[PDB]
Amino acid sequence: QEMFAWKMVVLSLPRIQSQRYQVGVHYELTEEEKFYRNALTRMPDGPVALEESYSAVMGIVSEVEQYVKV
Amino acid sequence: PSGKNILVFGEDGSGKTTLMTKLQHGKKGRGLEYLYLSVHDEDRDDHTRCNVWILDGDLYHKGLLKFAVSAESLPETLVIFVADMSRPWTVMESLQKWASVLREHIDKMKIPPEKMRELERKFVKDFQDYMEPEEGDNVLTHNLGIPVLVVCTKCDAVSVLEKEHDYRDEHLDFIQSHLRRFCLQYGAALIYTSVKEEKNLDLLYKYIVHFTTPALVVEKDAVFIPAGWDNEKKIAILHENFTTVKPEDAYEDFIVFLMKQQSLLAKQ
């Protein structure tokens, strides 16, 4: 089947809307909760991916838009 | 051909580097992306996009997980999800979570249809009929048939988890028993993989869609099992390694105003 574009875009649009909304907080919208670092000046930091938590819950839709080829 | 589907589930990602490299995102924690895979016909690929979406997390993404396991996989839907063989609780939890994730992606999306189980009775009867015996049958499986390949990975940490709480291979034998109990309770491939051992996760999925795959537990590192390896008699009798016979409890039991006022009162 050479129609791997229209159906992929429709299922993507469904998955894009179902991917750009990771509950906005989900009580844990990141890799994990706050934890302890190893050896640096960030013992009471937010997380190792606080700015990337946005990239994670946002990246779901980005991963769908990029891998929505076929 | 067109694009098929498989919904591999990984709880919030949590290091899918080795497990994903052994089989095939926006970040390390994106959430229900659309990954893929493909099958063959002895020479090359024939547009058979038998996608295996390794959804590393599903934060409020039930629709994305359902879109991943599309309805186009009626002829072949074998979800091969990653797991953690460090303990028996994680192995049994990941296998039951794989079957429940396939059922969740189906039932959370197929609420309108109902004759699917009716057609699945005859189709899966003709399919699993020639795949039930030769476990190296009659196993108490679920209400219907959802092929969920429980790929038990991370058995390199099984030794650390087995020595930190048992100082021997007791937790390893417990993980083997967890895979065997979930297999007899579901009827699938409890293929486990350790450090450089039994790299056959999609092998059972390919042999039971419409390469090699071993099955042994004597090495006490990776209790591999094929799609049909399901029994509860000899494995249940030998399940007494640091536990009882036919146990499942291991999974559940293992998963300056006041200052000025004070100065004034002190001066009195």
How many CB atoms are located within 10 Å of the residue B17 CB?
Answer: 9
Tokens linked to A55 = 């990239």
CA-to-CA distance for B17 and B27, rounded, in angstroms?
12
Tokens linked to B266 = 């002190």
CA-to-CA distance for B179 and B89, rounded, in angstroms?
10
CA-to-CA distance for B229 and B222, rounded, in angstroms?
15
CA-to-CA distance for B199 and B191, rounded, in angstroms?
9
On whether the CB atoms of residues B64 and A15 are closer than 8 A, the answer is yes
Position B3: which residue type?
G
Residue B131: burial class (beta carbons within 10 Å; 0-12, 13-18, 19+):
middle
Q: Which of A18, A20, A27 to mutate to test binding with chain B, by most B CBs within 10 Å of its CB? A: A18
Q: What is the dihedral of CA B241, B242, B246, B252, to 10 degrees?
A: -140
CB contact under 8 A, A62 and B30: yes
Phi, psi of B154 (to 5 degrees): 60, 45
> Which chain B residue lies closest to A51 (C-alpha atoms)?
B27
Residues 6+ apart with CB under 8 A from B100: none
CB contact under 8 A, B61 and A8: no
Exposed e or buried b for every residue in A38-67, given b needs 16+ CB within 10 A? eeeeeeeeebbbeebbebbbbbbbbbbbeb
Residues 6+ apart with CB under 8 A from B197: B155, B219, B221, B222
B3, B147, B169, B181, B233 from B237: Cα distances, Å: 44, 27, 18, 12, 6
A63 interaction partners in chain B (CB closer than 8 Å): 25-26, 30, 33-34
Q: Which of B49, B53, B60, B104 to mutate to test binding with chain A, by most A CBs within 10 Å of its CB? A: B60
A8 interaction partners in chain B (CB closer than 8 Å): 3
Q: HEC states along chain A?
A: CCCCCHHHHHHHHHHHHCCCCCCCCCCCCCCCCCCCCCCCCCCCCCCCCHHHHHHHHHHHHHHHHHCCCC
Half-sphere exposure of B71 (CA within 13 A, CB side): 9
Q: Enter the resolution in angstroms.
A: 6.7
B2, B50, B103 from B82: Cα distances, Å: 25, 18, 17
Q: Which residues of B are annotated as a binding site for ATP?
A: 10-17
Position A16: which residue type?
I
On whether the CB atoms of residues B186 and B141 are closer than 8 A, the answer is yes
A69, B53, B68, B195 from A2: Cα distances, Å: 12, 21, 19, 41
Residues 6+ apart with CB under 8 A from B139: B132, B183, B184, B185, B186, B187, B230, B231, B232
